[PDB]
Design a protein around this nucleic acid. Structure first.
Lengths: 150, 81, 155, 144, 129
RNA sequence: AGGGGAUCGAAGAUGAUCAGAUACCGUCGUAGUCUUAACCAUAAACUAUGCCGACUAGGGAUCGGGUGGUGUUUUUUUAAUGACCCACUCGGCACCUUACGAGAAAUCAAAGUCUUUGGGUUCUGGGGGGAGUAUGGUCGCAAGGCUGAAACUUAAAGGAAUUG
RNA sequence: GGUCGGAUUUCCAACGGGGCCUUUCCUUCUGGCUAACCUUGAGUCCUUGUGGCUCUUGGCGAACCAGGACUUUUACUUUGAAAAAAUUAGAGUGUUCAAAGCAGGCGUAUUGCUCGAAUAUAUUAGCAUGGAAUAAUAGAAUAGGACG
RNA sequence: AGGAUAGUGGCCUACCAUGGUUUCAACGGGUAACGGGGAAUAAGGGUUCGAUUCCGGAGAGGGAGCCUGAGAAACGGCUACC
């Protein structure tokens, strides 16, 4: 594991065997969907929407209680982003590393991590293009990445 | 050893094994019903909340995130499941 | 197509020995020659209705399909009325009991009755030499989804 | 494992890798480069004629002390001078000088045989007569 | 990364047999694995095995009997002709009288003697004896 | 190339030693040793052990994290905490015993699951020299780096262990 | 079983198949040889285990020839044809044996008969043919979706 | 589009377009290389050879050109240089 490191940790999330759970949840699935929608319009990403839902509410896994996944619900309600969440966070991290390197030129460690992060971005962008989530010939330019993340 | 029952192991063994190395892996985290003294509202929280959940009325603190299980505030009551 | 100066060249372009007699006026007013390719292929609606000349078409031309019928993916559409396909295949090496990937770029004439893009799969039929490198002509465009209109930015 | 590709489509890689490693075999390398055709006293031929130039005595290597009684001869076909050994008791008198001899290898495909440094050929015939026949007096050497 | 889950299954089975265990655990239990186990079970080289249905890939618990000498995969799955089946058995098997070569053919995952009866062929999978 | 230049110190001076010492030893001592901006890209750059994945043995430790406690602790001498003790667990640096296995052996929990030989993949080697040389190409301001033979010569070279 | 361990059978064991049913594909008109007949106005006598039942009025014909309301793509694998001859493996054949060769053998030699000169393999490519395990490929996600 | 051929064809001519091949090895260099049937060795897998009795190709010193002729760029045909 750790395609750009030497770690071999697992630290995963073991979701339950039950696919129709937790047998004590009383809120309607329509209430959950509108809860998700108001959170998306509040401006949260699907990952942090799920954790906020899982904590402040009893929803263990919204895919289980509802009929659709988080990102699927936002897309069907007209709230999906221009670039996917994980790709956006990767480009955000690359901009931070490049911004640091603009004034700390001699940080060859940050230069090494920038290449690792950027190669991670290009691998992910290749997947999104071959699945048509991104438009074709969509490119990470490293000069308009500041505008992509703002 | 050399002759075992991998199909019906002891719940003691399943208790001490890792969550992802049991016969069928599943979560060991649970949920809590929490009462803050300010109001009679009942609120569900995740044991590993990893966020500072707030009550509807006393919207300051209800549990404190930690590396593992969330540390509930000393000024509240909890109930499992 | 029907527009954009079918007759643009220095010489008049029209298929040989068809009498477009300007004396009598029928309902269609024009005589257009076509045929079927045979071996189960169909003459396209654009070839029957077409206004292009393309004396090399398998339907509105004098070429006939005989010999190998082949198929492949389109890789280049940069030159007029002809394209090049890639025929990927596996070659067996007996000594290692394994296969190695090989390909041949096949230059093929494409009639204006067909519209193709890079990446689609077309089926071509052998005919007599058309030019120095052309020995096949497009006979059926096997594009179903296209995989080009699904990658647009959404709204 | 095994450090080599195994997949069904790895035929090209296995061919190329084996082809590259064929150049480590000395048989394969000499055959492919045509070394015997290009750089060899003979042209890949078993026998060759030579004209005697001088008789010389090479001292045998350790641990044998003797004189090997060889001859430096020049090749007619390619203009190369080589040394050839004269195997028998005597037979140095049946080479004279400026004679015509027949040369063939020792049999160690190079790699000068035994304790005789710097010789890769031996004389089979001299003046058109077998050296063995001359040794046993079966025939006579020509006067020329 | 896992590339041949059948290899992982058979390797774990063979290693447990070598150390003498009566049972073994297998993951992730493909249906190629299950069909391979069924062929061995019919010929008597293993016993009952149970499929643990977790919602991800499944697991297998096989009760061994100590009658298995070796089970392995032949990777990659070479295409084998009818006449080439004899060659693969002469190499992979220790005797002409017993043992099998497991083939995946259009008629299903099947061993070489039964495939001989059906006069069908396919890609080689492995061996058991 | 500029700055810095305490100490130690390729070169060197010099006192010894010696048969000679331009070596070891002693007194100093330039370049270096430090830094900035550029070069070079090599080390026994080593665990002389490619990377990923599964299984196979018996322990006590230890680093980070998490969980639990008919547990202790200085505070409230009966509250969080923190620090300890005990029991698991995940990941890590490793250790000790034994090899069932492997190896030519030294030895190895991998160097095992190998003539009962196939989990995926990259690189490397084909007796010792000549030789990491010639030549051609390429990179460097150089030093040199990368790639890299042949002619010819040879019956050995080499690894591990035993006895003297 | 009058049939001297010797030459089986719809009682069947196991093999390799096909068709049909269980929610199970075979997309669709074009014409009739009247679906392996889901119709017995009539009726064929082998004198009581059970496979040789007639002229059958139609009555819903996919076991069939091209016009397309006819086409996911392969890889793989089975079978078939071609892969010149000779050579190679190999049947027959007292060149006196043999290498060989493709001849030879048999009559009473009364004036004649006859066997042969096989076979198998010969890859990789191309063509049909049966399979749909293994491996890859495509579809309905803003429905521009199928069904009449 | 035209010419040429027995005929398709950049075979050639004129106009117009900027295309075509390649790390799945183009292009270039070598071949002491004519290709195949086949020969040796060969448990299997394989290594090397095939100028040579059959097929196909090319040549008649090397180029170039041509008449006769169904068919030749012929060579025990012709024209030219070396």
């Amino acid at each position: 594991g750790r395609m750009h490191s030497a770690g071999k940790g697992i630290s995963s999330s073991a979701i339950p065997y039950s696919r129709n759970a937790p047998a004590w949840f009383k809120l309607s699935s329509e209430s959950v969907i509108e809860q998700i929608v108001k959170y998306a319009r509040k401006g949260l990403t699907p990952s942090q929407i799920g954790v906020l839902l899982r904590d402040a509410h009893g929803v263990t896994q919204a895919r289980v209680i509802t009929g659709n996944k988080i990102m699927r619900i936002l897309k069907s309600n007209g709230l999906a982003p221009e670039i996917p969440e994980d790709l956006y966070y990767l480009i955000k991290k690359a901009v931070s590393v490049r911004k640091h390197l603009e004034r700390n030129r001699k940080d060859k460690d940050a230069k090494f991590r920038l290449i690792l992060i950027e190669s991670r971005i290009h691998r992910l962008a290749r997947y999104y293009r071959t699945v048509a989530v991104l438009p074709p010939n969509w490119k990470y330019e490293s000069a308009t990445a500041s505008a992509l993340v703002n | 050893v050399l002759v075992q029952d991998l199909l019906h192991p002891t719940a003691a063994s399943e208790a001490r094994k890792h969550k992802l190395k049991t016969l069928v892996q599943g979560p060991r985290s649970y949920f809590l019903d929490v009462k803050c003294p300010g109001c009679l509202n009942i609120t569900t929280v995740f044991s590993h909340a990893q966020t500072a959940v707030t009550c509807e009325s006393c919207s300051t603190i209800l549990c404190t995130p930690t590396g593992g299980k969330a540390k509930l505030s000393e000024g509240t009551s909890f109930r499992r499941k | 197509s029907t527009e954009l100066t079918v007759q643009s060249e220095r010489a008049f372009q029209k298929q040989p020995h068809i009498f477009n007699n300007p004396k009598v006026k029928t309902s269609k007013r024009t005589k257009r020659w076509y045929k079927n390719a045979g071996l189960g292929f169909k003459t396209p609606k654009t070839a029957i209705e077409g206004s292009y000349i393309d004396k090399k078409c398998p339907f509105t031309g004098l070429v006939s399909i005989r010999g190998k019928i082949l198929t492949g993916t389109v890789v280049s559409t940069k030159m007029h009325r002809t394209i090049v396909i890639r025929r990927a295949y596996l070659h067996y090496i007996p000594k290692y009991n394994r296969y190695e990937k090989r390909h041949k770029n096949v230059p093929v004439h494409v009639s204006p009755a067909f519209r193709v893009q890079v990446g689609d799969i077309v089926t071509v039929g052998q005919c007599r030499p058309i030019s120095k490198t052309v020995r096949f002509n497009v006979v059926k465009v096997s594009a179903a989804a296209g995989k080009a209109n699904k990658q647009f930015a959404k709204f | 494992g095994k450090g080599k590709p195994r997949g069904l489509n790895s035929a090209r890689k296995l061919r190329v890798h084996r082809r590259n490693n064929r150049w480590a075999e000395n048989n394969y390398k000499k055959r492919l480069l045509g070394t015997a055709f290009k750089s060899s006293p003979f042209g890949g031929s078993s026998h060759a004629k030579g004209i005697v130039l001088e008789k010389l005595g090479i001292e045998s290597k350790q641990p044998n002390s003797a004189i090997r009684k060889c001859v430096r001869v020049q090749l007619i076909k390619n203009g190369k001078k080589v040394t050839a050994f004269v195997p028998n008791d005597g037979c140095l008198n049946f080479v004279d000088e400026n004679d015509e001899v027949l040369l063939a290898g020792f049999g160690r495909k190079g790699k000068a045989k035994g304790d005789i440094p710097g010789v890769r050929f031996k004389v089979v015939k001299v003046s058109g007569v077998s050296l063995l026949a001359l040794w046993k007096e079966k025939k006579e050497k020509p006067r020329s | 990364t896992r590339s041949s889950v059948l290899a992982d299954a058979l390797n774990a089975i063979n290693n447990a047999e070598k150390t003498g265990k009566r049972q073994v655990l297998i993951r992730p239990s493909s249906k190629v694995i299950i069909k391979f186990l069924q062929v061995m079970q019919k010929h008597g080289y293993i016993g009952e095995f149970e499929y643990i249905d977790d919602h991800r890939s499944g697991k297998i618990v096989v009760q061994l009997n100590g009658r298995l000498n070796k089970c392995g995969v032949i990777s990659p799955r070479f295409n084998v002709k009818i006449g080439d089946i004899e060659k693969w058995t002469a190499n992979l098997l220790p005797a002409r009288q017993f043992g099998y070569v497991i083939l995946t053919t259009s008629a299903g995952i099947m061993d070489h003697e039964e495939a001989r009866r059906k006069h069908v062929s396919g890609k080689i999978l492995g061996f058991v004896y």
